Amino acid sequence: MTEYKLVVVGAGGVGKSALTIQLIQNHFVDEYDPTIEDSYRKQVVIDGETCLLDILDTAGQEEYSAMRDQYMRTGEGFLCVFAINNTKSFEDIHQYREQIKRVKDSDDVPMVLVGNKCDLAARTVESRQAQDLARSYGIPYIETSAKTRQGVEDAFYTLVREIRQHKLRKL
Amino acid sequence: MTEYKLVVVGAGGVGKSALTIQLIQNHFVDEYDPTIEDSYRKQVVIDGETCLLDILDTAGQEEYSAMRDQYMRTGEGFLCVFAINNTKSFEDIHQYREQIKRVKDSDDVPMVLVGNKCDLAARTVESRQAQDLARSYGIPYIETSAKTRQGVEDAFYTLVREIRQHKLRKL
Ligand SMILES: Nc1nc2c(ncn2[C@@H]2O[C@H](COP(=O)(O)OP(=O)(O)O)[C@@H](O)[C@H]2O)c(=O)[nH]1
Ligand SMILES: Nc1nc2c(ncn2[C@@H]2O[C@H](COP(=O)(O)OP(=O)(O)O)[C@@H](O)[C@H]2O)c(=O)[nH]1
Ligand SMILES: [Mg+2]
Ligand SMILES: [Mg+2]
């Protein structure tokens, strides 16, 4: 079947493992070891297509850049996640995008911007600032909650769709 | 009269000296010494108010950050300029904004985003991506041309207006 190599990138504590796990085993996990970086697979049907998703849940002292190299140049799409309540994780998004553009040699690599923890009623990053940021980047922005599961399938599947279009564009 | 300390910041070659000089001596300068960093003053009337503008035309190996310190913590407003035809100068904007927020201790310091050289019919940065970026930052975006003078007065005066409102907000 088709295999999409995805990389979930972002500051620590944003919820990268919680989103990944949520998608894979459909259950929320608080306290997953901040240090552990590993891949996860699941077979899914997205728009009629059966495919295998290969996800790298990035963890690591890797200064706001390219965690698991031999997966970064290979990733076909990146999920840039920040937390709706941590403005710093949100400002750090530019740096990940630049490293991703840097290793991949292009400003046309599939990516989706994810504002996670939207279940927290608080926020230090308003929905509108994120959408303008995404807009200027030309990428989608989706709000998710690993805690309640809202938006996690839309986030990853939007990323697959982006990869699909991008492949279809060389013809 | 009132004095507004402004700092013009941005990658080399964008046109910081050409904008500054344009405003001060109303004439275009090609080839101004890339190394020279100095201040310039002019008395102007902006919205009925007579004021003295004190501008620091930043130049210097100062790694995408805070050129002329004893002016950065003191600047009351910053003009972030990039060239409409140099995408890198445009991506470097985030770093200047962060240094500016960093020394000034706040994400509420007056600034205006300036897309210069708009006389060149070309472009690698489209007007819309810049405006979304500005929007997400909450700041104005103005396109100017040091070469033809279009927009240079609007850029600096928009910056003064921003400083004015910001001062008026503590009451
Ligand atoms: N309320 C809430 N907490 C979350 C959400 N996603 C993750 N968390 C919590 O945020 C912390 C960090 O999650 P984790 O996936 O370990 O972070 P990361 O892998 O370093 O990005 C943990 O306490 C998670 O339980 C979310 O959507 N909602
Ligand atoms: N076409 C055009 N060239 C410009 C404009 N502004 C500056 N330049 C040219 O761009 C180069 C860099 O200008 P300068 O002010 O020295 O750069 P900076 O001080 O390092 O930001 C010079 O060749 C300037 O003449 C502009 O609005 N239009
Ligand atoms: Mg983790
Ligand atoms: Mg100069």
From Swiss-Prot, chains A, B:
Alternates between an inactive form bound to GDP and an active form bound to GTP. Activated by a guanine nucleotide-exchange factor (GEF) and inactivated by a GTPase-activating protein (GAP). CDD domains: H_N_K_Ras_like (cd04138). Pfam families: Ras. Changing K170R: Increased Ras signaling due to impaired ubiquitination. It is an enzyme of class 3 (hydrolase). Coiled coil: none annotated. The modification N-acetylthreonine is found at T2. Changing Q61R: Promotes interaction with SHOC2 and PP1C. Palmitoylated by the ZDHHC9-GOLGA7 complex. A continuous cycle of de- and re-palmitoylation regulates rapid exchange between plasma membrane and Golgi. S-nitrosylated; critical for redox regulation. Important for stimulating guanine nucleotide exchange. No structural perturbation on nitrosylation. Its main location: membrane. The modification N-acetylmethionine is found at M1. GO terms for molecular function: G protein activity; GDP binding; GTP binding; GTPase activity; phospholipase C activator activity; protein-membrane adaptor activity. NCBIfam families: small_GTP (TIGR00231). Belongs to the small GTPase superfamily. Ras family. Involved in the activation of Ras protein signal transduction. Ras proteins bind GDP/GTP and possess intrinsic GTPase activity. This is GTPase HRas. The lineage of its organism: Eukaryota, Metazoa, Chordata, Craniata, Vertebrata.
